[PDB]
Amino acid sequence: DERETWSGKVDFLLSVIGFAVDLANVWRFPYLCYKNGGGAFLVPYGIMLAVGGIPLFYMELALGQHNRKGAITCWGRLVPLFKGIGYAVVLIAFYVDFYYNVIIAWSLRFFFASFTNSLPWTSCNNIWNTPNCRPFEGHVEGFQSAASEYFNRYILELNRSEGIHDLGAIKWDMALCLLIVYLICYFSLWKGISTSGKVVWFTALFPYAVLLILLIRGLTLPGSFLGIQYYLTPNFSAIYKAEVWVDAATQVFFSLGPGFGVLLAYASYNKYHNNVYKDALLTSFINSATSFIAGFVIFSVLGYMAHTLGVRIEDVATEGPGLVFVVYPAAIATMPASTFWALIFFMMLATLGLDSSFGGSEAIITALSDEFPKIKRNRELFVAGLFSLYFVVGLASCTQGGFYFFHLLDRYAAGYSILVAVFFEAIAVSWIYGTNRFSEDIRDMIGFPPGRYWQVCWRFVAPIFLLFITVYGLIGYEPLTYADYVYPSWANALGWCIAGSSVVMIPAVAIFKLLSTPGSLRQRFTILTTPWRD
Amino acid sequence: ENVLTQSPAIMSTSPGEKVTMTCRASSSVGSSYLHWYQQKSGASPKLWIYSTSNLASGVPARFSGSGSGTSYSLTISSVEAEDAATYYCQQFSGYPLTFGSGTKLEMKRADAAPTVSIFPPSSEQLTSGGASVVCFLNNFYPKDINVKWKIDGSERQNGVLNSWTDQDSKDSTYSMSSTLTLTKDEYERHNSYTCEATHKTSTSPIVKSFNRNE
Amino acid sequence: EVQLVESGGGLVKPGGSLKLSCAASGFTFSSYAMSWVRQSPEKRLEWVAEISSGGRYIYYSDTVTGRFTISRDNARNILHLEMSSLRSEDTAMYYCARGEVRQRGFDYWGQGTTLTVSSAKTTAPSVYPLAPVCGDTTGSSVTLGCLVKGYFPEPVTLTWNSGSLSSGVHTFPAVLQSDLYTLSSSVTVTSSTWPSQSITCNVAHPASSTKVDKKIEPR
Ligand SMILES: CC(C)CCC[C@@H](C)[C@H]1CC[C@H]2[C@@H]3CC=C4C[C@@H](OC(=O)CCC(=O)O)CC[C@]4(C)[C@H]3CC[C@]12C
Ligand SMILES: CC(C)CCC[C@@H](C)[C@H]1CC[C@H]2[C@@H]3CC=C4C[C@@H](O)CC[C@]4(C)[C@H]3CC[C@]12C
Ligand SMILES: OC[C@H]1O[C@H](O[C@H]2[C@H](O)[C@@H](O)[C@@H](O)O[C@@H]2CO)[C@H](O)[C@@H](O)[C@@H]1O
Ligand SMILES: COC(=O)[C@H]1[C@@H](OC(=O)c2ccccc2)C[C@@H]2CC[C@H]1N2C
Ligand SMILES: [Cl-]
Ligand code: NA
Ligand code: NA
Questions:
Q1: Do domains B1-109 and B110-211 have the same CATH topology?
Q2: Annotated binding residues of A for substrate, as ranges?
Q3: Which amino acid positions bind substrate, per UniProt (chain A)?
Q4: Given a contact as 3+ CB pairs under 8 Å, which chains touch B?
C-alpha cells in the first residue's frame, strides 16, 4: 500500500535485460576475449562473474523488490545514515544520460545516412576526405581509413575542434537525432512502467533478431572461421596474468548494472513474493550469453576483413564506438545487400542503447517520485523538464568538439563514482544492515533463505572484488586523452568534481543526518542505523 | 483459507498391496509448496514428502508422490506394516498455512472373533455409591463390533461407555471396552447381567453373563 | 541430533491465559523460522503461527489472531507462544515445529505439550480391580482388569506390576463423559500364573497428585 506493479513479468525481465544489454556487449567483451587469450578468458570471466558480479546484481534486485521504493527512499528506509548512497547513485545516473544518449543519436544518424544503395563511408574521393585516406584500417596514426574519415570528418566534424575548449559549431543534424531520441524516450517513460514495460518488448528483443541475421550472414562469409579463431582460440598463459583477471572483474562489474539504482527501481515494482532469485540468474545469464553471441557476429566479419579485404587483424579488432561506427560498417559496405545489413545494424545499435537509457532515467524518476509526492503526482511534466535539461545541455555533444565532451563524461561520469557507491552498498547491506536481516527478508519474499554462498560473497568477496578493481584502476591511471589530443589540467579536475560530486553525498548526507538527530553519539548512531522496519 | 481435503479418510490394505491417497485443494497450490507428513499413533508428525515429489531423509523408496494445481497424491508401491499411520498433506504456498484432513492407513488381516470377558462391580466400588459392570471385547477383526448389555432378559441402552483401542502393531487386531454404570440400588435390584457382542465373525452373538449369587 | 521440547501447558479456565515454551537444541536456532502447530482431540492439524529467524516477520491464523502472541529468544534458544482469553476450542496438543524453507516444510517436530481449556474441576480417579466370576475357571488363559473411573483432566499413567509385564495388555483410551474421564485396562495371563503370582494395577494421576496400586484378588 500502495505501489504500481508490472503489467506482468516479461515486462520486468525484458526491462532488466534491455537495461543490462547494450553496446557494451558488442563493443568490449569480444575484444577482451581476443586480447586476453580467447576462450581461456572465460575462466577468469566466469569466476569473477560468479563471485563478484552476480551476487551484486542479485543484491540490488532483491533489495529493490523488498523495500518497495526508489533508490533514495530505499536506502533511507534501510540505513538512514547511509541514505546518501541513494542520492549518489541517482545523480550518477543523472550525469550519465547527458552523454550516453549521444551514442544512440550517432546510431540514428548513420541509420538515416544509410538509406542509399551507395554507402558514403566506403569511398576516399569525397569532399570530407584527406590525401591520407586509406580504403581500410591500417597501423599508422596519420592515415585513417575511409570509414574513419566519414565518422570524424563528416558525421562528427571533430577535425574542426582543437580540444574541449573549442566545441565549435552546433551540428543541427546531430541535434535533431538527439531530440528524436529523447522523444522516443519520453513517450516510452511517458506513463511509467505500464508503457515502458511494453516498449522494451521491441527494444530488448529486436537486437536478437538482428544479431541472428548478422550471425548467419557473417558465418557464411569467406574467412569467417578465421575470425572465430582469433576470437576464441585459447591461451591459458593469460590466466596467470593480473591484467587479465582485472579485465574480467571490471567487465563483469560494468556489464551488469548495479550502482545506478536502476535494478533497485525496476525490482521495486515487482510483486513482493515474486522470485527475484530466478530472475537474477536468468537475467545475468542472458546478458553474458548476448555478449558471447555478438562476439561471433563481430569477429566473423572481422576475419572476413582480414581474409578478403587484406587488413591486419590487430588493426580491425578494436573496442569502443570505433568498432560499431567505423570498422564494422566498413565491412558491411563490401558485402552484397550492404544497405540491408547497414540499416538493421544501426537500428540494433539504437535499440541496444534505448532500453538502457530507459532504466537509467527511470532510476531518477522512481527515486524522486517516492521521495517527493509533488513530482510523483505529476510524472508527465517532470520527465519533460528532465529531458529538456538533457537536450539543451546535450547540445554540447552535438557540437564539432562533441566527442571531446562525450569522452570526458564517459570517463568521469561514473568510473570510480559507481565503484565506491556499490562498495558502500555492499558494506551497508552485509555489515551495517546485516546479512541475517537481509537473508530473513529474502526468505519472507521467495520462501527460502539465500544459500550461504551468496552471504559470503556479499560480506567478503564483493568488497575486495570492488576493491581489487578500484585499486588496479588507480594503479594504471593516466590523464585523460583522446588520440593525439591531451585534455588540459582544468578539464581533468572538472571530471574529478563530477566523479566526487556523487560520492561526496554519502559522507555529507551522513553528517547532516548525524547532526539532525539529538542525543549521545553512540545513541545517535543507533537511531540512524535502525531500519524503517524496526 | 486454502482448504485441503483428503480421501479416503480411512484406508485398509494387505501388506505388499499398492495404496494411493489423494489431496485436493480449494485453490491452486504451487507444486513446490506441497508436502506430506506421516504420523504414527501416539507420536508426533514427521516430514515425509516435500515439494510433491521428494522423499525426506530416512524415507523408504517405496513411497512416491505426484500432483499439481489443485490435485496431489501419495502412493506406496508395496505396503509394509510399518507404514500403518495417518498421512497429512500440507500447503506452504500461502498464509494461513493449511493441513489436509488426513488419510488413515490401516493394515488388513484375516477375520478374527473377539474373546469376550465380563466383570462384576468391585467390592470397593460397591461401598462408594456407584456400580459399574465392565465387558472386554479383545483381539478381533475387523474393527466394527456391537455390544449389547442386558439386565436379566431386558435390554439396557443408556448409561454405557464404549472404547476401542488402536490397531495392534503385531497381530493388527482391535479391542473394545464397554462399561455399564448403575446405582447399586438399581444394581442390587436385579440378579442377572449379560454382555453380548455382535460381530461379523459369527451369525449369532458371543454372550457372557453372570448371576449375583456367585 | 536436533531436539525440540515443548513445555508448559495443562488445565486452564476459559478466558484464562497461559505461556508455552519450546527448547531448541542441536542446530543454530537463530537461523531457522519456527511455527506452532496444534492438534485437537479430534486429531486435526491446525497451523497456529509462524515466527522468522529474527522474529521480524510474524504470521497468525485467523482463529488465534489478537489472542495468541508468538515470540522468540535467540540467545537462550527458546520459542514461546503466549495465549490469552483461551476458549474451549483451543484445547489441543501444541507442537513446536521447525522449518526455514517453505519449499521444504517442517523438517523437525517436538514431542508436544497438552493444553486443556475447561471450566471443569480437577478430580482424582477411583481405581477399581476387576476380578473374574466364580467358575468355570478356564482353561486355558485368564483375563483380569482394572477400572479407572471419574477423573480429570488427562493424562493418567497405567502400568501392570510396575510395568514389568507389558505383554497381552490392552489399555483402552479414556472417554470423556460429563466432565469426567473413565479408563479401563485388561491384561491376559495363563491360568498357571494367576493367582499364583501377584497382579497389580498401577495408576498415576499427577494432576490430582494421586498414586495408587491395586492388587486383584478373587473375592
Ligand atoms: C553464457 C556463457 C557463454 C558465458 C558464461 C556463463 C556461465 C559460465 C556463468 C553465467 C553465470 C554463472 C553462475 C553464477 C552463479 C551460480 C550459482 C551457484 O550455485 C550455488 O552456489 C548453490 C547455492 C544455492 O543454490 O543457494 C554456483 C555457481 C553458479 C552456477 C555460476 C556458474 C557459471 C555461470 C553459469
Ligand atoms: C541471437 C540468437 C542466436 C538467439 C536469440 C535469443 C532469443 C530468442 C532469446 C534471448 C533472450 C530470451 C528471452 C529472455 C526472457 C524471456 C522471459 C520468459 O518469461 C519468456 C521468454 C523470454 C522472452 C526469452 C525468449 C527467448 C529470448 C528472446
Ligand atoms: O546532402 C546530400 C547527402 O547528405 C545527406 O545527409 C543528410 C543527413 O543524413 C540528414 O540527417 C540531414 O542532416 O540532411 C543531410 C543532407 O543535408 C545523406 O546522408 C547523403 O546520402 C546525401 O547524398
Ligand atoms: C554508462 O553506464 C552504463 O552503460 C551502464 C547502463 O547504462 C546506465 O546506467 C545509464 C544511466 C543513465 C542514462 C543512460 C544509461 C547500461 C548498461 C548496463 C550497465 C552499463 N551498461 C553496460
Ligand atoms: Cl559482458
Ligand atoms: Na552489458
Ligand atoms: Na540497453
A1: yes
A2: 22, 93, 97
A3: 22, 93, 97
A4: C
